């Protein structure tokens, strides 16, 4: 293996998902959270159980 | 490692403004005005590709009616006559004949008149 031709194994690395970056990606404008409510707030949600 | 937002936005915006050449006033000079106007033009052009094909059919039909009433027929009787004889000319070629080759149009109108004479 030469340092100018590296290749990881297939299926081993994936990219990432970035929310709030435009409409056509699928997750712009509220970033998967739906409309209003306690679960749409930063730090929103109820404790486990 | 910090990423300045240097020259990407100006390229995109200048691509949008170039599509707005010829518009009125602040609609070819300001980016927001041009953005909205260009979106509306896209909508209009898609709509009008489909409406074009209707306009020319009405134009041909009215010219054919005009020509046929000179040969003793109307549009609907002449179309029926041509179908009962197995003739398959477009309304486009029919109108083109009606304006250029009146003798060809009369040959055809006589065939139609004989077909529905039965």
């Amino acid at each position: 293996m030469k340092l100018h031709e590296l290749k990881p194994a297939e299926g081993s690395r994936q990219v990432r998902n970035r929310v709030g970056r435009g409409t056509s990606s699928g997750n712009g404008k509220t970033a998967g959270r739906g409309q209003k409510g306690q679960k749409a707030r930063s730090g929103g949600g109820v404790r486990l159980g | 490692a910090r990423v300045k937002g240097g020259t990407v936005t100006r390229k995109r915006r200048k691509k949008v403004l170039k599509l707005a050449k010829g518009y009125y006033g602040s609609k070819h000079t300001l980016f927001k005005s041009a953005k909205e106007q260009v979106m509306n033009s896209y909508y209009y052009a898609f709509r009008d590709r489909r409406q074009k094909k209707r306009d020319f059919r009405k134009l041909w039909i009215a010219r054919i009616n005009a020509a046929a009433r000179m040969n003793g027929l109307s549009y609907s009787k002449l179309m029926h006559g041509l179908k009962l004889a197995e003739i398959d000319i477009n309304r486009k070629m029919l109108a083109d004949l009606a304006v250029n080759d009146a003798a060809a149009f009369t040959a055809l109108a006589e065939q139609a008149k004989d077909a529905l004479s039965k």
């Binding site: 293996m1 030469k2 340092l3 590296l6 290749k7 990881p8 194994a9 081993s12 | 490692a1």
Partner: protein
Amino acid sequence: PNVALFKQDGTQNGEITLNEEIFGIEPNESVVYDAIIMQRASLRQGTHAVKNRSAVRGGGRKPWRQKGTGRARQGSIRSPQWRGGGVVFGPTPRSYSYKLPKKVRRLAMKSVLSDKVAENNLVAVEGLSFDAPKTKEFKQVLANLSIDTKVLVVLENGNDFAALSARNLPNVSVVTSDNVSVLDVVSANKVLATQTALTQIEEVLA
């Protein structure tokens, strides 16, 4: 696997049979990728910081009132959207290093040296001796064996005159036989190892 032997100038002074568990074992290519990536992320010094809202030297007072002024409600002169304010989610001091399990370290070492051997890219030599540290004689030696690429020079021990002579040549790297890494062997085109150092490497990779 047998490699040919040379002297500081000469010819084919026979051959040298090396281990088959170390120098002839069919390399594994993803293990080498993992080793290279781990080692490169292991050299970072992650010394980077920025100031959030509460570290910027600034104000605790509400700048105007909450209503009436025909304004927009503001909370401090140092908010993320104000010019000169604090940064939301910047770089923090971090580590960047991790460890792979012990059998795959050893598998990557074996695999990279065995790849070097499987293409006649390792060159064995009886000895490298020098009465003074002279760069010019090392370059002559290097051309004596017709070596025209990037080369890793693996030496034994307190062979200090040779390491001095081989420094400073811009195609040459020098390492001792107790200190070879995976990144040293992959980057060079060839390895020039002495007979003594070869047995010493076979003693530690076992």
